[PDB]
């Protein structure tokens, strides 16, 4: 049988494209500067026969083979719009400078799941070269002090940059999905404990004095109202900030004594 | 015995745990003596001689003048290993006799 | 249990018990002879009546008189070790000859007295010494129990292998056993409420503490995953209808 | 001493069948017929014998005594597997005068 | 509630309704802070927040307004579980076709477009041009076009020609496909074409287009413009220790399709040429391919991973084949496991439970008693009290556990008795105690087995474990009526020693008053345990129900037999105790106690036997010693005599008198004859070894040896195992299949040699290798039988049918194997039972046969009674309880709601772990000979020779029933003796199977007609005038001229008149087959019935599983199609075709058979369509379509029972016939008229459609059908629900078929409700479904 591969079916169409001549490419760039829909479309196919050889050199990266071909095409479109016919330079000589920059522009943005700005990727590739160069002259395992010595960088800075290269492996590849748990509480006994504890707090604040309960419900917001500070709650009940603070300690001791005689220990709550 | 019970009997001796007190079996097959020497857990004397000093941690023996070189004749230190964590989480120790 | 001999045919297990009685039986006569302060010349005759009497290898008359006799008598006071090859073992006539030397019944059986009722047994039983072993199958690593623990993210199922664990997987063959009976509330309990129900297990735990045994319908968490995964393929599911 | 038949370049547990998981009359003195770990892998893993010795090419060899027409000499030779079909191997225990 | 789930294609308008936003950016998280951003895969604007009631800015965090939306950003406040329901969708620039319609073998797009699988792919990849909407143009829609071909088409046409290429060209045709007009083109051309490959293609076109319109589906819904995305909670990013995190494989697939979509969304206004606009679309089409499924076509790979990417198709299937991982196993709470331990001081209705497990399993129950009492008001204070284990916690722990039953089950469960509820009792230790009597049902020994535990919670589950799953209710086995709680090996041994009789013992001849006075003398020591005494008993007879009478009777029994009567209740007589009380004696005692007293007294009687069995066994000194294995003195005489006979045989082999082929048979027959001679002399010495002396001379009694007690009682051991200890082992089997000529002389007591022990390893390793494979085959067999018997639930109470099957005892063979009373026990009667005399009735109607009716039918001479079988009762949606027999576990009738389909499949797979001449007729009994289905004419000599191949010899006893029925071959000479008593061993037939007898009913002169010399007949004689006859020639060795000539020796009168046999106008003629030797020459008188010519003539799990799959064997038997005249085909044509011509109606159609198999080459005989022609294996496919349905059900039960009865197990016939009902549900139609020609419809679906259409003016709207047998693998997939077909196997093909059809699922089965979460419609869940349909039917 025959498999309709994306790489084989694309390279077969390249053979049906004529070569670009240096005498006609200069005349074609003159028609493209004035403005013509067929001139830019025809000239785009001339420099297209080079994208299959440039992208074939770069391999073993995060992008697939088909992504390097489509990305290289966007480089010649931005390069064919800006051309100098009076300078006499070759159109293909200027196109090979933009496709190389466009390939490296997309090789660092789609290689990792986390989007990283240009300020932090320009340091990982340099450290990747430094980690490969220092490992060749030493022929041993590179340490953290060796990287900070050759690059003349602080020891604390080289540790954070090397930690950004996560390179997360697979999960379903064994499973790992069954062994992992959740950070949030999901135990039925723990959820019932938070229910009985919260219901006892609203019950304890109501069984105490009515005056000692409304001064703490507005400060911390245990009853559900909006929380207030010492100055915000002053204009509500009492402007004397010193008098409303003395009753807070008295209500704090009453809630502590009512908790010890209730059968619950404070040291057993934290455990 | 039957051939079926001989296959199951060979597995009971394989998954055996060393007890605290070791007692020699009253009935044996003769291969129980040649099986402990070939194993690496027993300490076998390399150079024969008179035992100068013995302890629960090390055993020092004095090499005779016959089976010895010209210099450094009585130089042999046998350090007995203490309880270490084995692969199956079982104690391993050596006792002088 | 003596009922395991006919089916699990191991005759060597019974012959080992009879031979083990003569090993410990002869060891008591040597240890008792030391307490009588007998002469060294009398102990060498008793040792010659053991190694140089039955057929096999006999080694003696090659050790020191006083030094080596007290060393062997103190080591053989807990049983005389016997060697029996895998295919050159002792016949039945040689085993009975050793019991005669230790003043023991050659039949290998003796009537034992009970300790609870105190009456003597009607039939004689077989006693002896058998070398037993212990396998690495302790119950501390096998006993497990867990009421409530942690769950996963994709499927709200109980976990295992952590610090706190211990659970039984309700396989498919366990389901066909409940369908064979008339049980319907028990099969739905251990499949929808006791597992794969976040809001179901929360309300069920509160009903047990209050003292009200009731069950809510809920929705299995293992079924909601199949609905969302089958909809991404483009297939529509009218679950509500 | 345990020798297995699984691993790289060997049959697995499923495609074994019944021929690989069976004993052959040529296992006399080379492979233990009664020692085999029970479970899913029965017959694939089999331990060696006591007097088992590897050959020059890599085959298994077993020691045998040289028997003449008049008496039995003390010459002990190691016989291979394919060369054992010609000679008549007697029993280990026989009547001796 | 909810029901009626649907499956259909998604519409572009419906996808935009479930979505909450549009995603366009692959970025989802930030490196500075681990919080999601806007327009991402884990974003909070479309999906829910990362936590409960929070937003991105963090301004509103209150609980007052949960539904409010944030004004600063687009993320609103919600709960944490909302991230599982919300989802999004991506906007694609170009539509892409899915792979579900192209992955399966029949392409769903090609059948609707009249295109192939390769052609529909060439258009989507921009490889070829197609034209649409031609109108007034010669170009067709199905024809292809190239780049140069499309340009030349526009020059000759000029206009009205639009050639489009890509996915839009395919979608442009589906909108104007004219499905209403496309069906008319195929229906109008249906009678025009006449082909086999074209008719099958026509049926698939009409059956799919009818379901496409009847479901409300649209053609444009196949291709989707937008693609929904999975919620982020199913593919999370969970961090672990070390600052690292994990990303699922699905996040990489979604990232690849999003960035490529933006590369196409930004190249719509850059004036892209044709070279790249065709390749950039394929980059998106391959991304959707890798997202749906991998490994088939794309097989995409990633970095640092050799395994392919887990797509959405591989995550739903998982491992274990097509079954999901969640369905095969689901973790549950309130469970545990430990090591078992036997406890003799436990009751039958309870078990043991450690204190450390009861405190963890019942943790929520303890918190409910501490708060209700008033000790701990806060649940936190009660948690600290149960962990410290104070003395007060142990008080409430024993109070909450008093009558709350728990469940116990082993890891492997093969039957319903694996899960039995028990009442936990607090013990001290770390092991779970179990009752010693229930270990026979669990099939577990105390050798390290671990059992599970479960705790019910709701009040409905506590009442369920006390009514059906209790240990006291499931006493009888689900396979047969024999109880499974029968005393085990140890307790039977104690009871066998008690019921003994000694000739001389202490305290013999004494007289005791009552059982209480007899027990007082035994404890004092003045009376032995087994001694002949004379006691008076007090027993009650229960012959009349409701009344109990007492009577005193003095019997002569022993002291041990009198103590056992104190255990059995007074409802049973004394004759059930005076026996030896073996293992089979107690099995019949519990079965008799269960059907006389009841169940409340049986549990107490079964528990008291374990106490009295163990108490009297500990006082016995039963021990196995070396002196117990006695050796008979006759062993040395037989071995020395057999060794001298072999020396005479081997000496003759070197001379040349005896060959090696016969020496092997003589040696294995000499040592075998010597093997039984030692066993007979060994058992005769062991049974009478003990010699007692009394009153002078000694006497002989049964030996009291320890080894003989374990064999006579049957508690542990067998009779064949004694021959290996005290006797010779005999011949052994080699792994290749042969037997060694020399046996093993020694035994286990004397010791084996080095070479003799090596022989016993061949049979031992093969036995240990089989027990590792039967666990996989038996587990696979019970899964295929239970998947086809799930929808069979008893729901009706009165059907009203009058059909059934004839039941007859096992009369085949020399003696009876299975009586009639053991076959119809519990099965109701179908019709009226008639006495031997007319105008008499025994059973009036279909009453349930019980133990009272078994003895009533055994006293009469009735033997052929018809019963109601599950293969009958053609009602739909279950099986009526009337036609179904009695319950196997309960003594009463089967109630409404019991799932008899599951208990029938488990009863077959339960015993799977245990399962691995004819010259003359000599009768063994005496009686009147009665012939049935045998036509024999009179003989002039008086021998009464019958040349018919159909016949059977049956001898009737004095009662009138056929005791023994033998098989009579063709051409057998038998003398009739009807009305005369026959002696035992008298010869009735003297036939010879070496030569095929040929006889002719015509009596007269015979002359050969149509015989040519040198072509058909050859004058060949033997040497020295040994045989002087006429030998015929073969059909293949003959010449070309005598190939079509067939000899026919016609018989006429001696005077010259043509003689013909009555019945047929064709005169009788003698057959002349090939290689035949006729001794009587032509022209001589021959007697009637004389010989005319002389013509010379696995097992196990794969055998039982072959009958349920309807697998055709390698060599199938050849039978006849229509009865009539039998002849021989032409040998020159190469295909023997036996033409038929019945007297009633001539049928020109016939069949052809190849010349590879030679059988029944006789020219001229009867057809006998029911009788087989070619001897060999018979296929069940040809039996159903020839005789009917009653013989196929009788043949399956007969062959299946012959495989299970070989090992020793006993399975009732109700479970074998239950599976036969589900396999015979599919039928085929020949002339429908109202539906398709060849289709698969159910029998119940065709019967309801036939009866409704008959009620009309034409009275001929109905059609005819034919029954067809299907295997268990093909009948499982033939279900209406797609859930049952997806969980079995191949969930990919069934998921695509339900999409294009639009089937509405009705949840009314067992496997369909366990995945949704509702109650099962079987068992106690039937009352819940009865109220649901009642409310739904009202409106
Ligand atoms: Mg077991
Ligand atoms: Zn916000
Ligand atoms: Zn019925």
Author numbering:
A (entry chain F): 57 to 230, 238 to 334
B (entry chain C): 679 to 775
C (entry chain C): 1116 to 1356
D (entry chain C): 533 to 629
E (entry chain D): 16 to 931, 946 to 1126, 1135 to 1376
Relevant lines from the article:
Pseudomonas aeruginosa (Pae) SutA adapts bacteria to hypoxia and nutrition-limited environment during chronic infection by increasing transcription activity of an RNA polymerase (RNAP) holoenzyme comprising the stress-responsive σ factor σS (RNAP-σS). To understand the molecular mechanism of SutA activation, here we determined cryo-EM structures of RNAP-σS holoenzyme at 4.1 Å, SutA-bound RNAP-σS holoenzyme at 3.1 Å (SutA-RNAP-σS, open lobe) and 3.9 Å (SutA-RNAP-σS, closed lobe), and SutA-bound RNAP-σS promoter open complex (SutA-σS-RPo) at 5.8 Å. The structures reveal that SutA pinches RNAP-β protrusion with its RNAP-binding domain and wedges RNAP-β lobe open to facilitate promoter unwinding with its wedge loop and N-terminal D/E-rich region. SutA anchors RNAP-β protrusion through its RBD and wedges open β lobe through its wedge loop to facilitate RPo formation.
As no structural information is available for bacterial RNAP- σS holoenzyme, we reconstituted Pae RNAP-σS holoenzyme and determined its structure through the single-particle cryo-EM approach. Focused 3D classification resulted in a single group of RNAP-σS holoenzyme particles, from which a cryo-EM map of the RNAP-σS holoenzyme was reconstituted at resolution 4.1 Å. The cryo-EM map shows strong continuous signals for all domains of σS except for σS1.1. The weak fractionated map signal of σS1.1 domain in the main cleft of RNAP suggests its conformational heterogeneity and low occupancy. We compared the binding affinity of Pae RNAP core enzyme towards σA1.1 or σS1.1 by using a fluorescence polarization assay. The results showed that the σA1.1 domain binds RNAP core enzyme with a Kd value of 220 nM, but the interaction between σS1.1 domain and RNAP core enzyme is barely detectable under the same experimental condition, indicating that σS1.1 binds to RNAP core enzyme much weaker compared with σA1.1. Structure superimposition of the SutA-RNAP-σS (open lobe) and RNAP-σS holoenzyme complexes shows differences in RNAP-β lobe conformation and main cleft width. In sharp contrast, there exists substantial steric clashes between the modeled dsDNA and RNAP in the RNAP-σS holoenzyme. RNAP-β lobe of RNAP holoenzyme is in rapid equilibrium between open and closed conformation but with preference on being closed.
